[PDB]
Design a protein around this ligand. Sequence first.
Ligand SMILES: [Zn+2]
Ligand SMILES: [Zn+2]
Length: 413
Amino acid sequence: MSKISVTVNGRRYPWPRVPAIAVCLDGCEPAYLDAAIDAGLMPALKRIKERGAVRLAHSVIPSFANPNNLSIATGSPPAVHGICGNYLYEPSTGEEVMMNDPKFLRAPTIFQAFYDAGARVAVVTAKDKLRALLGKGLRFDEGRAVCFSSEKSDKATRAEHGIDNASAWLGRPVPEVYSAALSEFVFAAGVKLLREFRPDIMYLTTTDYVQHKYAPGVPEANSFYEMFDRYLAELDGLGAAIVVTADHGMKPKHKADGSPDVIYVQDLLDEWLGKDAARVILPITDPYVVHHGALGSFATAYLPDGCDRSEIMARLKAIQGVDVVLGREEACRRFELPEDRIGDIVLVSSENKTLGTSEHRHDLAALDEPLRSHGGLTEQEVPFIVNRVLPELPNAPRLRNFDAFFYAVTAAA
Ligand SMILES: [Zn+2]
Ligand SMILES: [Zn+2]
Protein backbone atom coordinates (compact mmCIF):
# COMPACT_ATOMS: atom_id res chain seq x y z
CA MET A 1 0.00 0.00 0.00
CA SER A 2 1.36 3.42 -0.98
CA LYS A 3 0.93 6.23 1.57
CA ILE A 4 -1.93 8.72 1.19
CA SER A 5 -1.09 12.41 0.80
CA VAL A 6 -2.47 15.76 -0.32
CA THR A 7 -0.18 18.10 -2.25
CA VAL A 8 -0.80 21.86 -1.80
CA ASN A 9 1.36 24.66 -3.29
CA GLY A 10 4.18 22.19 -4.01
CA ARG A 11 4.27 20.61 -0.55
CA ARG A 12 3.22 17.02 0.22
CA TYR A 13 0.99 16.61 3.31
CA PRO A 14 0.63 13.04 4.62
CA TRP A 15 -2.92 12.13 5.59
CA PRO A 16 -3.37 12.67 9.36
CA ARG A 17 -4.28 9.46 11.29
CA VAL A 18 -5.45 11.57 14.26
CA PRO A 19 -6.73 15.20 14.09
CA ALA A 20 -4.01 17.69 13.17
CA ILE A 21 -4.33 21.12 14.77
CA ALA A 22 -2.42 24.37 14.47
CA VAL A 23 -3.01 27.13 17.01
CA CYS A 24 -1.92 30.60 16.08
CA LEU A 25 -1.39 32.56 19.29
CA ASP A 26 -1.57 36.07 17.85
CA GLY A 27 1.33 38.30 18.99
CA CYS A 28 2.81 35.61 21.22
CA GLU A 29 6.33 36.88 21.87
CA PRO A 30 8.07 33.72 23.17
CA ALA A 31 8.70 35.54 26.47
CA TYR A 32 4.94 35.47 27.26
CA LEU A 33 5.05 31.65 27.47
CA ASP A 34 8.31 31.52 29.48
CA ALA A 35 6.86 33.86 32.13
CA ALA A 36 3.47 32.13 32.43
CA ILE A 37 5.21 28.72 32.59
CA ASP A 38 7.67 30.08 35.21
CA ALA A 39 4.72 31.43 37.24
CA GLY A 40 3.31 27.85 37.45
CA LEU A 41 0.31 28.83 35.30
CA MET A 42 0.81 26.49 32.30
CA PRO A 43 1.27 22.91 33.60
CA ALA A 44 0.00 21.37 30.32
CA LEU A 45 2.32 23.36 28.01
CA LYS A 46 5.22 22.83 30.45
CA ARG A 47 4.72 19.04 30.23
CA ILE A 48 4.06 19.15 26.45
CA LYS A 49 7.36 21.03 25.93
CA GLU A 50 9.34 18.52 28.02
CA ARG A 51 7.91 15.49 26.17
CA GLY A 52 7.48 16.97 22.69
CA ALA A 53 9.39 19.26 20.32
CA VAL A 54 10.36 22.82 21.20
CA ARG A 55 11.56 25.29 18.56
CA LEU A 56 11.62 28.91 17.50
CA ALA A 57 10.39 29.68 14.01
CA HIS A 58 10.46 32.68 11.70
CA SER A 59 7.30 34.48 10.68
CA VAL A 60 6.83 36.20 7.33
CA ILE A 61 7.97 39.82 6.94
CA PRO A 62 5.97 42.00 7.33
CA SER A 63 5.24 40.48 10.75
CA PHE A 64 1.48 41.22 10.69
CA ALA A 65 -1.61 38.98 10.98
CA ASN A 66 -2.86 38.92 7.39
CA PRO A 67 0.33 37.83 5.52
CA ASN A 68 1.18 35.42 8.33
CA ASN A 69 -2.22 33.75 8.89
CA LEU A 70 -2.56 33.27 5.16
CA SER A 71 0.97 31.84 4.94
CA ILE A 72 0.08 29.35 7.69
CA ALA A 73 -3.18 28.50 5.86
CA THR A 74 -1.45 27.83 2.51
CA GLY A 75 1.98 26.64 3.76
CA SER A 76 3.55 29.24 1.48
CA PRO A 77 4.90 32.82 1.66
CA PRO A 78 3.03 35.91 0.29
CA ALA A 79 4.94 35.68 -3.04
CA VAL A 80 2.76 32.59 -3.54
CA HIS A 81 -0.58 33.44 -1.92
CA GLY A 82 -0.68 37.21 -2.58
CA ILE A 83 -1.68 38.59 0.84
CA CYS A 84 1.03 40.99 2.07
CA GLY A 85 -1.04 43.54 4.05
CA ASN A 86 -4.56 44.75 4.87
CA TYR A 87 -4.91 46.90 1.75
CA LEU A 88 -3.47 47.18 -1.75
CA TYR A 89 -2.57 50.51 -3.38
CA GLU A 90 -3.47 51.33 -7.00
CA PRO A 91 -0.98 54.03 -8.10
CA SER A 92 -2.57 55.17 -11.39
CA THR A 93 -5.89 55.86 -9.59
CA GLY A 94 -4.91 56.74 -6.00
CA GLU A 95 -7.13 53.86 -4.87
CA GLU A 96 -6.65 52.10 -1.53
CA VAL A 97 -8.56 48.86 -2.11
CA MET A 98 -9.13 46.63 0.94
CA MET A 99 -7.33 43.28 1.00
CA ASN A 100 -9.75 41.26 3.14
CA ASP A 101 -11.90 39.94 0.33
CA PRO A 102 -10.93 36.35 -0.63
CA LYS A 103 -10.72 37.33 -4.34
CA PHE A 104 -7.19 38.60 -3.52
CA LEU A 105 -5.92 35.15 -2.44
CA ARG A 106 -4.05 33.54 -5.36
CA ALA A 107 -3.24 30.05 -4.02
CA PRO A 108 -5.38 27.29 -2.48
CA THR A 109 -5.40 26.82 1.28
CA ILE A 110 -4.40 23.52 2.91
CA PHE A 111 -8.00 23.52 4.17
CA GLN A 112 -9.55 23.45 0.70
CA ALA A 113 -7.00 20.89 -0.51
CA PHE A 114 -7.83 18.45 2.29
CA TYR A 115 -11.55 19.26 1.98
CA ASP A 116 -11.50 18.44 -1.74
CA ALA A 117 -9.66 15.19 -0.93
CA GLY A 118 -12.62 14.22 1.32
CA ALA A 119 -11.39 15.37 4.75
CA ARG A 120 -13.25 17.01 7.63
CA VAL A 121 -11.88 20.52 8.12
CA ALA A 122 -12.46 23.25 10.72
CA VAL A 123 -11.34 26.89 10.84
CA VAL A 124 -12.09 29.21 13.75
CA THR A 125 -10.88 32.82 13.85
CA ALA A 126 -11.43 35.51 16.51
CA LYS A 127 -11.94 38.37 14.03
CA ASP A 128 -14.35 37.97 11.12
CA LYS A 129 -12.18 39.70 8.47
CA LEU A 130 -9.74 36.77 8.44
CA ARG A 131 -12.69 34.30 8.33
CA ALA A 132 -13.67 34.82 4.65
CA LEU A 133 -10.02 34.69 3.48
CA LEU A 134 -9.22 31.55 5.46
CA GLY A 135 -12.50 29.93 4.43
CA LYS A 136 -11.93 30.30 0.67
CA GLY A 137 -12.89 27.17 -1.30
CA LEU A 138 -14.61 25.40 1.57
CA ARG A 139 -18.13 24.01 1.01
CA PHE A 140 -20.90 23.42 3.53
CA ASP A 141 -23.27 20.96 1.82
CA GLU A 142 -21.72 17.69 3.06
CA GLY A 143 -21.23 18.38 6.79
CA ARG A 144 -17.44 18.17 6.32
CA ALA A 145 -16.47 21.82 6.96
CA VAL A 146 -16.92 24.43 9.68
CA CYS A 147 -15.60 28.00 9.39
CA PHE A 148 -16.64 30.95 11.61
CA SER A 149 -15.33 33.75 13.83
CA SER A 150 -15.95 34.50 17.50
CA GLU A 151 -16.75 38.07 16.40
CA LYS A 152 -19.66 36.93 14.22
CA SER A 153 -20.42 33.58 15.87
CA ASP A 154 -24.09 34.45 16.21
CA LYS A 155 -24.38 35.09 12.45
CA ALA A 156 -23.07 31.63 11.45
CA THR A 157 -25.40 29.55 9.26
CA ARG A 158 -25.23 25.92 8.08
CA ALA A 159 -25.14 26.98 4.43
CA GLU A 160 -22.33 29.52 4.75
CA HIS A 161 -20.33 28.45 7.85
CA GLY A 162 -21.32 24.77 8.40
CA ILE A 163 -22.92 25.59 11.74
CA ASP A 164 -26.19 27.31 12.82
CA ASN A 165 -25.28 30.07 15.33
CA ALA A 166 -21.90 29.09 16.86
CA SER A 167 -22.69 31.29 19.90
CA ALA A 168 -25.90 29.34 20.74
CA TRP A 169 -24.10 26.09 19.83
CA LEU A 170 -21.13 26.74 22.17
CA GLY A 171 -23.35 28.21 24.92
CA ARG A 172 -21.36 31.42 25.24
CA PRO A 173 -22.24 35.04 24.41
CA VAL A 174 -20.62 36.85 21.47
CA PRO A 175 -17.53 38.40 23.02
CA GLU A 176 -16.38 42.03 22.84
CA VAL A 177 -13.95 42.49 19.92
CA TYR A 178 -11.47 44.23 22.24
CA SER A 179 -11.12 41.51 24.88
CA ALA A 180 -9.24 38.34 25.83
CA ALA A 181 -12.69 36.72 25.64
CA LEU A 182 -12.75 37.02 21.83
CA SER A 183 -9.76 34.63 21.84
CA GLU A 184 -11.07 32.37 24.63
CA PHE A 185 -14.20 31.68 22.53
CA VAL A 186 -11.89 30.35 19.73
CA PHE A 187 -10.19 27.89 22.11
CA ALA A 188 -13.53 26.70 23.53
CA ALA A 189 -15.02 26.29 20.04
CA GLY A 190 -11.87 24.32 19.13
CA VAL A 191 -12.29 21.82 21.98
CA LYS A 192 -15.99 21.37 21.25
CA LEU A 193 -15.30 20.84 17.53
CA LEU A 194 -12.53 18.37 18.31
CA ARG A 195 -14.95 16.29 20.47
CA GLU A 196 -18.13 16.58 18.44
CA PHE A 197 -17.10 17.30 14.84
CA ARG A 198 -13.79 15.35 14.75
CA PRO A 199 -11.91 17.33 12.06
CA ASP A 200 -8.89 15.86 10.25
CA ILE A 201 -7.48 19.40 10.02
CA MET A 202 -8.28 22.33 12.29
CA TYR A 203 -6.94 25.87 12.50
CA LEU A 204 -7.48 28.10 15.55
CA THR A 205 -6.38 31.72 15.38
CA THR A 206 -6.74 34.51 17.97
CA THR A 207 -6.11 38.28 18.24
CA ASP A 208 -3.32 40.15 19.99
CA TYR A 209 -5.52 42.59 21.97
CA VAL A 210 -3.96 41.48 25.31
CA GLN A 211 -0.40 41.48 23.94
CA HIS A 212 -0.58 45.05 22.50
CA LYS A 213 -1.68 46.20 26.00
CA TYR A 214 0.40 44.07 28.38
CA ALA A 215 4.04 42.97 28.58
CA PRO A 216 5.16 39.38 29.32
CA GLY A 217 4.74 38.37 32.97
CA VAL A 218 2.28 41.07 34.08
CA PRO A 219 -0.93 39.79 35.71
CA GLU A 220 -3.26 40.35 32.70
CA ALA A 221 -0.83 38.71 30.24
CA ASN A 222 -0.27 35.76 32.59
CA SER A 223 -4.03 35.24 33.02
CA PHE A 224 -4.53 35.03 29.23
CA TYR A 225 -1.91 32.28 28.94
CA GLU A 226 -3.17 30.49 32.04
CA MET A 227 -6.56 30.45 30.28
CA PHE A 228 -5.07 29.14 26.99
CA ASP A 229 -3.29 26.33 28.85
CA ARG A 230 -6.59 24.83 30.09
CA TYR A 231 -7.86 24.49 26.52
CA LEU A 232 -4.49 23.21 25.32
CA ALA A 233 -4.65 20.52 28.06
CA GLU A 234 -8.06 19.44 26.70
CA LEU A 235 -7.03 19.34 23.02
CA ASP A 236 -3.92 17.36 23.94
CA GLY A 237 -5.89 14.93 26.17
CA LEU A 238 -8.32 14.30 23.33
CA GLY A 239 -5.38 12.86 21.31
CA ALA A 240 -4.87 15.48 18.57
CA ALA A 241 -1.43 16.28 17.18
CA ILE A 242 -0.86 19.98 17.89
CA VAL A 243 1.48 22.73 16.76
CA VAL A 244 1.41 25.94 18.79
CA THR A 245 2.83 28.94 16.96
CA ALA A 246 2.19 32.67 16.32
CA ASP A 247 1.72 35.09 13.42
CA HIS A 248 4.40 37.42 14.92
CA GLY A 249 5.87 38.43 18.27
CA MET A 250 5.55 41.71 20.15
CA LYS A 251 7.97 44.40 21.39
CA PRO A 252 7.68 47.73 23.29
CA LYS A 253 7.80 50.67 20.83
CA HIS A 254 8.04 53.68 23.14
CA LYS A 255 10.39 56.35 24.47
CA ALA A 256 11.21 56.60 28.20
CA ASP A 257 8.28 58.98 28.85
CA GLY A 258 5.92 56.25 27.55
CA SER A 259 5.05 57.96 24.27
CA PRO A 260 5.36 56.48 20.73
CA ASP A 261 8.76 56.70 19.06
CA VAL A 262 7.75 57.25 15.42
CA ILE A 263 9.58 58.01 12.17
CA TYR A 264 7.18 59.81 9.81
CA VAL A 265 8.13 58.60 6.33
CA GLN A 266 5.60 60.69 4.37
CA ASP A 267 7.05 63.93 5.79
CA LEU A 268 10.58 62.83 4.83
CA LEU A 269 9.53 62.09 1.24
CA ASP A 270 7.31 65.21 1.06
CA GLU A 271 10.39 67.22 2.04
CA TRP A 272 12.79 65.55 -0.44
CA LEU A 273 10.53 65.03 -3.47
CA GLY A 274 7.59 67.41 -2.95
CA LYS A 275 4.28 66.96 -1.13
CA ASP A 276 2.41 63.75 -2.14
CA ALA A 277 4.88 62.99 -4.97
CA ALA A 278 5.45 59.69 -3.15
CA ARG A 279 2.94 57.49 -1.30
CA VAL A 280 3.83 55.72 1.97
CA ILE A 281 1.76 52.60 2.78
CA LEU A 282 1.31 51.12 6.29
CA PRO A 283 0.01 47.51 5.91
CA ILE A 284 -1.02 47.13 9.60
CA THR A 285 -4.18 49.21 9.23
CA ASP A 286 -7.11 50.15 7.07
CA PRO A 287 -5.98 53.72 6.12
CA TYR A 288 -9.16 55.60 7.17
CA VAL A 289 -8.69 54.84 10.91
CA VAL A 290 -7.51 57.47 13.45
CA HIS A 291 -6.37 55.24 16.36
CA HIS A 292 -2.80 54.09 17.23
CA GLY A 293 -3.56 50.46 16.31
CA ALA A 294 -2.19 51.87 13.04
CA LEU A 295 1.49 52.02 14.12
CA GLY A 296 3.89 49.23 13.06
CA SER A 297 7.51 48.64 12.12
CA PHE A 298 7.15 47.96 8.39
CA ALA A 299 6.39 50.35 5.53
CA THR A 300 6.47 50.44 1.77
CA ALA A 301 6.64 53.47 -0.53
CA TYR A 302 5.51 54.18 -4.06
CA LEU A 303 7.87 56.78 -5.61
CA PRO A 304 7.45 59.30 -8.49
CA ASP A 305 8.49 58.00 -11.92
CA GLY A 306 12.08 58.80 -12.91
CA CYS A 307 13.31 59.79 -9.42
CA ASP A 308 16.62 58.48 -8.03
CA ARG A 309 15.62 55.41 -5.97
CA SER A 310 19.19 54.53 -4.94
CA GLU A 311 19.64 58.06 -3.53
CA ILE A 312 16.33 58.07 -1.61
CA MET A 313 17.27 54.73 0.03
CA ALA A 314 20.63 56.12 1.18
CA ARG A 315 18.94 59.05 2.94
CA LEU A 316 16.42 56.76 4.68
CA LYS A 317 19.10 54.26 5.76
CA ALA A 318 21.18 57.10 7.24
CA ILE A 319 18.37 57.77 9.76
CA GLN A 320 18.67 56.19 13.22
CA GLY A 321 15.82 53.77 13.88
CA VAL A 322 15.57 52.79 10.20
CA ASP A 323 17.25 49.37 10.07
CA VAL A 324 16.47 48.06 6.59
CA VAL A 325 15.83 49.83 3.26
CA LEU A 326 15.49 47.76 0.09
CA GLY A 327 14.34 48.16 -3.52
CA ARG A 328 11.23 46.28 -4.69
CA GLU A 329 13.21 43.53 -6.43
CA GLU A 330 15.52 42.85 -3.49
CA ALA A 331 12.79 43.18 -0.84
CA CYS A 332 10.58 40.72 -2.72
CA ARG A 333 13.40 38.20 -3.15
CA ARG A 334 14.54 38.43 0.47
CA PHE A 335 11.12 38.54 2.20
CA GLU A 336 9.36 36.37 -0.41
CA LEU A 337 6.75 38.98 -1.36
CA PRO A 338 4.81 39.62 -4.64
CA GLU A 339 6.37 42.41 -6.74
CA ASP A 340 2.97 43.53 -8.06
CA ARG A 341 1.65 44.28 -4.54
CA ILE A 342 4.61 46.17 -3.04
CA GLY A 343 6.02 49.72 -3.34
CA ASP A 344 9.24 50.82 -5.06
CA ILE A 345 11.03 50.69 -1.70
CA VAL A 346 10.61 48.70 1.55
CA LEU A 347 11.40 50.01 5.07
CA VAL A 348 11.83 48.13 8.35
CA SER A 349 12.39 50.08 11.60
CA SER A 350 14.44 49.19 14.71
CA GLU A 351 13.27 47.22 17.78
CA ASN A 352 11.81 50.16 19.78
CA LYS A 353 10.68 52.47 16.92
CA THR A 354 7.70 52.47 14.52
CA LEU A 355 6.97 53.95 11.09
CA GLY A 356 4.13 56.42 10.44
CA THR A 357 2.95 58.60 7.57
CA SER A 358 2.91 62.33 8.39
CA GLU A 359 2.94 64.82 11.28
CA HIS A 360 1.06 67.91 9.97
CA ARG A 361 -2.62 67.80 11.05
CA HIS A 362 -1.45 64.46 12.57
CA ASP A 363 -2.91 61.13 13.70
CA LEU A 364 -4.59 60.57 17.10
CA ALA A 365 -3.73 58.67 20.31
CA ALA A 366 -5.88 55.73 21.48
CA LEU A 367 -5.21 53.94 24.80
CA ASP A 368 -3.35 54.68 28.04
CA GLU A 369 -0.58 52.05 28.03
CA PRO A 370 2.78 52.64 26.28
CA LEU A 371 2.93 51.44 22.67
CA ARG A 372 3.64 47.78 21.93
CA SER A 373 3.74 46.53 18.33
CA HIS A 374 5.23 44.45 15.51
CA GLY A 375 5.83 44.30 11.73
CA GLY A 376 9.62 44.31 11.72
CA LEU A 377 12.44 41.79 11.94
CA THR A 378 12.44 42.14 15.74
CA GLU A 379 9.05 40.41 15.97
CA GLN A 380 9.86 37.65 13.48
CA GLU A 381 10.86 35.04 16.07
CA VAL A 382 7.91 33.01 17.37
CA PRO A 383 7.34 29.82 19.40
CA PHE A 384 6.80 26.57 17.52
CA ILE A 385 5.92 23.78 19.92
CA VAL A 386 4.64 20.32 19.00
CA ASN A 387 3.01 17.82 21.37
CA ARG A 388 4.88 14.94 19.68
CA VAL A 389 8.47 13.65 19.57
CA LEU A 390 10.07 15.13 16.41
CA PRO A 391 13.87 15.25 16.66
CA GLU A 392 14.27 16.08 12.93
CA LEU A 393 12.11 19.21 13.28
CA PRO A 394 14.29 22.12 12.08
CA ASN A 395 14.91 25.32 14.06
CA ALA A 396 14.77 28.94 12.86
CA PRO A 397 15.74 30.37 10.36
CA ARG A 398 14.86 27.22 8.39
CA LEU A 399 11.66 26.55 10.38
CA ARG A 400 8.83 28.94 9.56
CA ASN A 401 5.50 29.54 11.29
CA PHE A 402 3.97 28.50 7.95
CA ASP A 403 5.50 25.05 8.41
CA ALA A 404 2.88 24.52 11.17
CA PHE A 405 0.47 22.33 9.24
CA PHE A 406 3.28 20.44 7.48
CA TYR A 407 4.67 19.22 10.80
CA ALA A 408 1.27 18.90 12.51
CA VAL A 409 0.06 16.40 9.85
CA THR A 410 3.47 14.67 9.73
CA ALA A 411 3.22 14.25 13.50
CA ALA A 412 -0.45 13.15 13.10
CA ALA A 413 0.58 10.58 10.49
ZN1 LIG B 1 -1.14 39.49 14.98
ZN1 LIG C 1 -1.07 43.37 16.40
